[PDB]
């Protein structure tokens with residue numbers, strides 16, 4: 044089961060930022076954010092994902108943009124940015 | 129007159145996010161978002177602010193949560209998080 048502090052689907056920030064815990068159901072094709080084809084975009088390779096968040100698991104990680112919460116590594120939002128060198 | 133796409137108080141996203149174009153009149157103290165003293169928080173030091181948005185001025189700048197629109201640099205909403213990276 045999801046952590047209790049998972050980002051909720053209809054959290055107001057999640058709504059505004061176009062977060063979806065399943066990237067395949069997200070607006071990523073429409074958004075056309077640069078750096079990878081949309082089909083390759085998800086939280087796991089994002090700049091803002093925080094691997095060392097409290098309560099992180101292989102599936103659930105922090106995000107700079109959702110303080111105190113956990114996103115799904117297979118998620119996406121409109122701030123997706125490939126983590127660069 | 130302000131940019132045509134300045135965020136209005138009756139914008140539906142604004143209401144959901146608890147945006148106020150005057151941070152001093154916002155809920156920022158009670159909300160106590162982490163990362164800076166709440167009384168110092170406003171759009172100008174927020175991670176979501178986009179200073180190079182089309183139509184921006186020294187007063188009106190972009191926000192990732194209000195695509196296509198301009199917030200006030202002195203504003204605040206409950207999604208505030210410190211600009212960082």
Ligand code: SF4
Pocket residue numbers: 062085086087089090091092093105106107108114118119120121122123124
């Ligand atoms: S900023 Fe990155 S890690 Fe955070 S929810 Fe959006 S895509 Fe996922």
Ligand code: SF4
Pocket residue numbers: 147170171172174175176177190191192193199203204205206207208209
């Ligand atoms: S997310 Fe940040 S920049 Fe956007 S309205 Fe809220 S406080 Fe202002």
